[PDB]
């Protein structure tokens with residue numbers, strides 16, 4: 001992701017077939033002539049999409065121009081959470097399924113995986129970062145405290161940001177409860193709150209290289225969201 005000072009980002013297309021699929025997804029959802037109510041509602045939860053972009057001298061080099069969801073924040077605290085029971089897609093080979101399950105074999109049980117976090121600490125005027133191995137090390141026993149870490153800012157547990165996140169995720173859950181046309185694998189939620197010196201959160205869906213047509217509820221995604229909501233709710237009792 002390349003952050004631009006105009007409030008947008010450029011996301012380089014992943015190698016094929018993943019990049020091309022993600023392009024196709026953004027093009028479908030944001031089709032100017034689209035009047036599908038499911039897709040019009042979905043736009044609210046995605047970064048705004050400004051089309052394919054390449055450098056003036058390099059039409060080979062393909063990016064998505066997207067809204068920078070952290071732009072309105074001063075000291076953004078950011079967490080990326082992969083959602084679902086399966087991070088492989090319906091056409092994955094045996095090898096690929098094994099590859100994906102082995103990356104985090106608790107995916108089926110927990111239904112989400114923390115990809116990373118960046119947390120502003122007021123006392124030190126600095127950021128604490130956690131990489132992909134942080135989330136992959138969390139179990140049923142440590143997931144609550146693992147998620148809690150994201151909200152430790154300003155000398156306190158930020159229960160305002162926790163509650164706002166639940167409220168925002170609930171709207172995304174409601175969208176999933178009311179569509180049976182897309183299933184999302186290896187997709188994420190990006191959480192942002194203000195770390196600088198209340199209740200102000202962004203939650204957006206990102207990462208769409210494995211979104212497929214469906215005729216059922218996305219049950220794995222729903223499971224993950226619900227479990228994430230339940231974990232966040234338990235953090236409100238701390």
Ligand SMILES: COc1cc(-c2oc3cc(O)cc(O)c3c(=O)c2O)ccc1O
Pocket residue numbers: 001009011047066067068069070071076078118190206207
């Ligand atoms: C502070 O820099 C970050 C920016 C982002 C970021 O990621 C995106 C990923 C997408 O697939 C689409 C996006 O629109 C964003 C985004 O806007 C963003 O700020 C994520 C983590 C970060 O540490």
